[PDB]
Design a protein around this ligand. Sequence first.
Ligand SMILES: [Mg+2]
Ligand SMILES: [Mg+2]
Ligand SMILES: [Mg+2]
Lengths: 326, 320
Amino acid sequence: MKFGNFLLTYQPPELSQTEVMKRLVNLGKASEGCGFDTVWLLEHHFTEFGLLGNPYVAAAHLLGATETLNVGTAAIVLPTAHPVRQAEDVNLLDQMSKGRFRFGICRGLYDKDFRVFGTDMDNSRALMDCWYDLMKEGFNEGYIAADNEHIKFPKIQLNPSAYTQGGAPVYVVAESASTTEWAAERGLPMILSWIINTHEKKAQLDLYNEVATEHGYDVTKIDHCLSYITSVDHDSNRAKDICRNFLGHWYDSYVNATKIFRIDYSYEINPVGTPEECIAIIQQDIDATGIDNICCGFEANGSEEEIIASMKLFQSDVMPYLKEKQ
Amino acid sequence: MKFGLFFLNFMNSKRSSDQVIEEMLDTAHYVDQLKFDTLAVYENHFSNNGVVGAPLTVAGFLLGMTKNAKVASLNHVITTHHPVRVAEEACLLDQMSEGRFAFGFSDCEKSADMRFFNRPTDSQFQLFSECHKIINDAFTTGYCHPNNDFYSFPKISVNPHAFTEGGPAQFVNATSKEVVEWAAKLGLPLVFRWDDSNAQRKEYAGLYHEVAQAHGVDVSQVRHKLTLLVNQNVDGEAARAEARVYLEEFVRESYSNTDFEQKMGELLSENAIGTYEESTQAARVAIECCGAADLLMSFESMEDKAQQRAVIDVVNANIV
Ligand SMILES: [Mg+2]
Ligand SMILES: [Mg+2]
Ligand SMILES: [Mg+2]
């Protein structure tokens, strides 16, 4: 069983930016000791919803500070940055860390990003697909060239070379059936949403498998991840109140981010409550999906001390009991 | 004078990109405990003369792996990049490291790169200048809001806001008279380049003084930097031969419109290369010529790791 810790770098009303950044640093560094094998970093721009706009740079910092910890993006908004610069970033991370970087990607949800970075949100799907083909070409061949409707540039040598054959492992946040299909055609693992229920997760993987299988991939070896909002406490209601209060503030921040220029019942389908309750919810999903990579976000928990406390309780009282699908 | 190291990360058919990066990290770990106070990263794209195209990303890793040295981008090329990405990243490094990052930036020295990135060279300086404005606005206020020939978008908070009041420290590469004059006017420190001739560096130093005085800018406290290559060997001839092989492609790439031999010979005699005696004298001359307060050295041309560490040691002892 593998365990991932998600860091959103979200700024709740009670913390300053500087406090948020210090916590990002500390939480990253404490993850491995809490039994997490990977730290996942979300990208966000210009709002308190998430202060980290450059996860490749934050990943570099965390990877530099560790030895065996893997660090990934969940996820880079693919379309809003030059694909060649992103390939250089990924190969540098791959090389510096000696293969510990995990490249999670997505289409992009916020118009503000497209607006500022000069991209057409209307074409996010095409752009993500295009950029991925260019980066993969660089990862595989050591050179990249483009002459298409989205971009054009001469053939260049891409430095440095990929450390991992084929480039750092890619992961996809699939927000649509079409994204699920796109991932399946390339045999790429998905990072499943924490706001869909077991049935929906199983359906999504069923759609995925159909495609992947058709392509020849062995669906049993793809590293899909289950994502969760996590709050562990021997006092069930306490965990739940904290979670609900937090999501209040957070959802508002989300809406605000969508306009600069579901989540509610969430708690019921996430490991929020006693460790026993957490075991039950997660095992239900494992049982239905066969996934063995559990990714959890603990920021809703409070102060850095409370967050760490929650991480440690998950570690001691949840982790050991989860079992791979029978 | 303060002393630091910089990494070019030149590769070849024998020294692969994987190997140079590993060597950079090992060197960084090695000197973090010595008297050198800064580790700077050179930016290059699409050629063997530098395998790091994202110096800010490498600065992040270097900061996470060390504790004492300041870490800097040596010449992050802002002209070919989105200034909001640059500001966000620099602020992020400042925050994550609690102020240990210094922002060395530069205008684009390769027209090919401007073309690559679809940036017209005819309005290059204007572009450069608007980029810096956006970065500096962010650094100093946490926000930006351009409406110019190159960038136009609504007012935004550039997160995270800087940890250091006024943003991380900045310095600009002396790449043209135009940039030099612009820096003097802003009172910004310069970084004089190892690959420029001493006459050229002196010319830049003079111009900067002249423009600053003319505009009444107090630069009495500005500390300019100088980069120099170091290669020491009791067999001075072997040192120059080794540096020659190391620099051959660079001269052909970056100094194509000048006599190869002449340029190569100047680089070999002006940089801190040769015997200990020759190397040190060259360095004294280069500092005197440009008046830099801080010296950044690259020891990478010495293929023999033991010799390279021994040279780093002699230099360190001599500061100390
Ligand atoms: Mg406070
Ligand atoms: Mg597996
Ligand atoms: Mg002789």
